[PDB]
Amino acid sequence: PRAPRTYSKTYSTPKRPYESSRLDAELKLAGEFGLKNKKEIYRISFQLSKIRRAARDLLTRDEKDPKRLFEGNALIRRLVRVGVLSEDKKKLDYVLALKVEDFLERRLQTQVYKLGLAKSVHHARVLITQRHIAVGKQIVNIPSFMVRLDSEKHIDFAPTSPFGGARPGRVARRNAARKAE
Amino acid sequence: NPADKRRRLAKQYLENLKSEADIIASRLKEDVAEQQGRVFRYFGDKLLISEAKQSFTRVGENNLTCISCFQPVLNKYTFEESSNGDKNKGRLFAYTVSKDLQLTKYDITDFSKRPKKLKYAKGGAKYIPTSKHEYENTTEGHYDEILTVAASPDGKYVVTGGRDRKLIVWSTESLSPVKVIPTKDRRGEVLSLAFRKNSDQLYASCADFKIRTYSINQFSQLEILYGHHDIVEDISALAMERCVTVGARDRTAMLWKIPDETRLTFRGGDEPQKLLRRWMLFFCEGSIDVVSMVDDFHFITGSDNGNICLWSLAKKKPIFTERIAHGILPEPSFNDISGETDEELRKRQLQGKKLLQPFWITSLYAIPYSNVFISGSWSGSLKVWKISDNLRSFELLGELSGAKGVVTKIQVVESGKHGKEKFRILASIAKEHRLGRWIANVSGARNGIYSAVIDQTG
Amino acid sequence: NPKAFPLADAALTQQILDVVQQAANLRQLKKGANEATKTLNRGISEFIIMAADCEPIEILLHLPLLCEDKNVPYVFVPSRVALGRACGVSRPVIAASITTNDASAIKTQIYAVKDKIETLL
Amino acid sequence: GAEKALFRKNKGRISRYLANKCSMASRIDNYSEEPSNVFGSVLKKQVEQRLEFY
Amino acid sequence: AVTIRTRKVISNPLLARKQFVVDVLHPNRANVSKDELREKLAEVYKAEKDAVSVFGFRTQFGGGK
RNA sequence: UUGCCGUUGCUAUGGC
Ligand SMILES: [Mg+2]
């Protein structure tokens, strides 16, 4: 038979989901970032935990270790590229200082909100899911899309979108047709 | 069999070269070199700038805003001149616009003699549209500032537009308006015009951040191009449809492949901090203010930091730069910087050389497929530059100090045999910059057409 | 020490003039010394721009007196002809003002430039 | 100074024009350690050319 | 308008042909059928239509190419 | 050679 295709879980349930302080924390995160459910928060937390555990393991290694240098440098480059880690903080210690909010801001939903294309984070979500937002020349419909520094300046209304210069959507032309008739 | 016909045309063409005289072989490559989009007119070294016969001809109209020159050309494909009629055989014409809403044509056939006026047409308040609607802005004459002029390569029409959001095409012989094409935009003011070489296609750059393509023979609009984030101030065209434009403060030069409907991005991205470090005054570019195509695969631009940049289609960044080409402006006068009686107090306000700023490249024109181009400012002299053989750098060939004022637009015209060619440079001179009147009145600046005939010897 | 102070450098002036042109397109720019004075009186000015080559310089020194009284950042550019150019007006401008608007489409770069101007001060 | 007519249809234009010139004139004097009269002279001359025009 | 760009061109005289990847920009259009692509490629490379084969065409998410 | 006003020759350039 054909060789297996690997798969993995992108989120993990917390050690104690029932902490009241925690519950308030996810309430904050969902409310401010307009997240649909808790699974999104758990996913981001799992990714962050993997990153910081790798950083800790790298720190345990002695300085100038070739593995340390190579892998730490790669991790810092990736974190800088996605934009969570600022340029002036290129050391493994500050990686351990990252927070869930940093990743959350880089989500295409939040970036769309900040750029002024949407009046609410929920408005940003509905705009994205309705194929109105394009990074560069390509249309992205996924709120969880993570924006890179270079990609940030290229977010715009899609060419095919009615807001982006295309013809009016179905409702608009339907109303115009009935009005003319 | 049409191949026999080509052979006959080639045979007659070959006989011409024998009259023109290795030499035959080289000249054969040169004539078709227009087809291959590469520079093939290497005459910079043999040029004689110092002996140029300079002349300044005064003109009544104020702020001459642009000039367009028409030159008949022998076409190798059919071996016939481009003159519109038998009367116009080898007659050179120049058209000019001003902020006085007046069109004027001049005969520039006689290099030794100054431009001679033939006919003119003037606009005014009579031509204001009553309707107030964009699509009814179809009056015969102009009513607002005329900014640009272009002559059709066929010698049959001359087309002008300006801040009236209108483009009027006129008959060359009588300067009679034959068609009016509104831009149909609230802010669609025409800023530059360029005729495709040896074609009737016209490219118009408008203030509404768009480029509009027209067909003069059909008197109709064709397409609109989008992609600039700021006004499209200048446009240049060659035989091929790869017209180039500069978007002013968007600081991006753009090449448009019309049939491919794609557009190549070009940005300077130079920073003083690295320039000073590599040196271990430099003014950071704010806006690109002129563009002209030296080649199908190369073009040059001027900025508002006095930087002349050479470009190639392959590379996104500039390949060679000439910073502060026209020099730095005079320092502000100490008697006027401050009202302090004490002179030393006034000198402190000059703040050393920090307040000093560079000249702007108001004009920049390159002879097609050649190794020489001309730049202009209100420094009071026209500078002639020569590009290297490898097309990787250029050097200052010389200067012409006759011009005094803002050089709104530079044109070059050639005459004589292929071996012996005399180049006559015509530059419109004004007292204020074409797009507006920011510039402080330059001492001595006059409204006129500057002329300089240069002989070619070696 | 010089009356025009602080004076932006070649790099810094470009971003400032960049915001100026964007503000002019969006009707968020007030052009001329007289207008800038009015904005400072109303407390609707985000920050004020002046040209260091004003001839004479004194006729705009009243804005600095107003500015830090109202705790408004300000900065000088070397050129007025350049400042007028970016303003979109066919004449030189010695001073201009960026009107406050937290709903503006160009908010982010306005605060970015403002942060640098505060650092320069 | 519009209560005592210090600055005083065509007449009204001069008053507004003169008021502006007085304003910058005050600015030069106030923010000048040792004010001079060089600018005031030309500024008044500028008013004179504006005066004769109307 | 529709534009056809050929990339990664290889000349295989073993099989007596030319291989390439065809990228088709088709703004404001659903897609280009294999017939039009064949006739345009035949014109571009100056060959008989029957000598041009095209397949495996996928439009990216969002359309346009 | 200029819309106007001068100078300079028998042509060339100063100011608005
Ligand atoms: Mg759709």
Whether residues A160 and E61 touch (CB distance < 8 A) is answered with no
Provide CB contacts within 8 A for D46, sequence distance 6+.
D21
Provide, as residue numbers in chain E, all residues whose Cβ is less than 8 Å from the Cβ of B262.
3, 25
By the 8 A CB rule, do A145 and A108 touch? yes
Q: How far apart, in whole angstroms, are the C-alpha atoms of residue B354 and residue A147? A: 40
Place of tokens 């000073």: B276
Question: Hey, is B196 helix, strand or coil?
Answer: coil
Q: How far apart, in whole angstroms, are the C-alpha atoms of residue B160 and residue B148? A: 6
Place of tokens 């991790």: A75
Q: Show the tokens assigned to B132.
A: 């107030």
Residue B374 phi, psi dihedral angles, 5° rounding: -120, 140
By the 8 A CB rule, do B422 and B80 touch? no
**Does chain A touch chain E (at least 3 C-beta pairs within 8 Å)?**
yes
Provide, as residue numbers in chain A, all residues whose Cβ is less than 8 Å from the Cβ of E30.
none
Query: Which of D34, D44, D46 to mutate to test binding with chain B, by most B CBs within 10 Å of its CB?
Result: D34
Structural domain boundaries of chain A?
17-181
**Does chain D touch chain A (at least 3 C-beta pairs within 8 Å)?**
no
Whether residues A159 and E61 touch (CB distance < 8 A) is answered with no
Strand partners, B220: B215
Q: How far apart, in whole angstroms, are the C-alpha atoms of residue C4 and residue B108? A: 52
Of residues C4, C9, C79, nearest to B349 (C-beta)? C4
Whether residues B262 and E27 touch (CB distance < 8 A) is answered with no
Q: How far apart, in whole angstroms, are the C-alpha atoms of residue B202 and residue B376? A: 25
Q: Show the tokens assigned to A30.
A: 């969902």
Give residue A13's region: left, alpha or beta (phi > 0; psi -120 to 50): beta
| Number of compact structural domains in chain C | 1
**Domain CATH number, residue C14:** 3.30.1330.30
Q: CA E9 → C1' F9, Å?
A: 75
Q: How far apart, in whole angstroms, are the C-alpha atoms of residue B44 and residue B372? A: 6
Strand locations in A122-166 (E): 133-135, 138-139, 155-157
Smallest Cα distance from B341 to chain D, Å: 5
Buried b (16+ CB within 10 A) or exposed e, C82-116: bbbbbbbbeebbbbbbbbbbeebebbeebeebbeb
Closest CA to A135 of B411, E61, B322: E61
Closest nucleotide (C1' vs CA) to B117 is F1
Whether residues B340 and D32 touch (CB distance < 8 A) is answered with yes
Q: Which domain holds residue C109?
A: 1-121
Provide CB contacts within 8 A for B361, sequence distance 6+.
B289, B290, B302, B303, B304, B306, B307, B308, B325, B326, B375, B376, B377
Ligand 1 centroid distance, CA of A112 (Å): 19
Q: CA C72 → C1' F12, Å?
A: 58
Provide, as residue numbers in chain A, all residues whose Cβ is less than 8 Å from the Cβ of E62.
131, 134, 138-139, 158, 160
Helices (H), ranges, A34-120: 38-60, 66-82, 92-95, 100-105, 108-115
Question: Hey, is C31 helix, strand or coil?
Answer: strand
Q: Show the tokens assigned to B326.
A: 């026209």
Task: Give the E window 11-50 contacts with B, CB below 8 Å.
Answer: 25, 27
Q: How far apart, in whole angstroms, are the C-alpha atoms of residue B137 and residue B165? A: 8
Residues lining strand F at under 7 Å (Cβ) are B 55-61, 114, 116-117, 441, 443-444, 446-448
Q: CA B305 → C1' F11, Å?
A: 41
Residue E53 phi, psi dihedral angles, 5° rounding: -120, 145
